């Protein structure tokens, strides 16, 4: 099964860590918890942002251009990316925008963090059609000393 995991500001705005105004160590912990020991598929800008492989996960980078780092697996198409994951219970797609758009129709699960922040940006999480999904988990947290904004973890499953 294929899942997407993303952090969304108001109006579904998303972006690279350097672009976004929030600091949410609790969300990073949520991301790690839900991706550890699973393959992760990301686009090239997301790879450039993390700077090194995510530990404890098979790192697969989807790009039309040749790889430039032999520490990770490079693929040129959605089908190649899925094949590179082999036989696993769950594949985690970790963005960014174009990658989310390419995998959404194949996905059966979404892990979303809804952040209470208004952010200017051109990149958005794809319009998922809410009535096609069932909300199976929701957990709200206020901002605190460590976390800059309030946020809500949600898991949705495709009907």
């Amino acid at each position: 099964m294929i899942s997407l995991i993303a952090a969304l500001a108001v109006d579904r705005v998303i972006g690279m860590e350097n672009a976004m105004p929030w600091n949410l160590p609790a969300d990073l912990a949520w991301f790690k918890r839900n991706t550890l020991n699973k393959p992760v598929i990301m686009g090239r800008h997301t790879w450039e942002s993390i700077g090194r492989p995510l530990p404890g996960r098979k790192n697969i980078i989807l790009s039309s251009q040749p790889g430039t780092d032999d520490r990770v697996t490079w693929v040129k198409s959605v089908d190649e990316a899925i094949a590179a994951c082999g036989d696993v219970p769950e594949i985690m797609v970790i963005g960014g925008g174009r990658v989310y758009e390419q995998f959404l129709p194949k996905a059966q699960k979404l892990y979303l963090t809804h952040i209470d922040a208004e952010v200017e940006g051109d990149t958005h999480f794809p319009d998922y059609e809410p009535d096609d999904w069932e909300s199976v988990f929701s957990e709200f947290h206020d901002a605190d000393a460590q976390n800059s904004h309030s946020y809500c973890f949600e898991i949705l499953e495709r009907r």
Partner: nanobody
Amino acid sequence: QVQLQESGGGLVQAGASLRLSCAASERLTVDYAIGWFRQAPGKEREFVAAISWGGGLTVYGESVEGRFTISRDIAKNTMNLQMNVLRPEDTANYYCAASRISYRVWNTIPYNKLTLWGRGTQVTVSS
């Protein structure tokens, strides 16, 4: 490429302050971070401070936390490092860098993974 141009280095006494500046020749995009590393004679280069260009969020090396403050101005396309309560062991060549690597990772990333560098500015702190 975009050039990183450093200024502000000099010689001051222990306990004084000094302000370094790094101006990028072309406007940075929101996905970049910009920051400082330093290298003292005979020592390995080490991380000092970084700020995300879009978010304006900061991180510091353990040896300068509390004493140094990094900031950036979007309009002037410049970043500044205000260095206070300087110590002799802060003496080094200071280098500005920029990269798409998340600012949060700069305290542990190998410095050569950053692809944009200034040429270095000398800071000397004497007792």
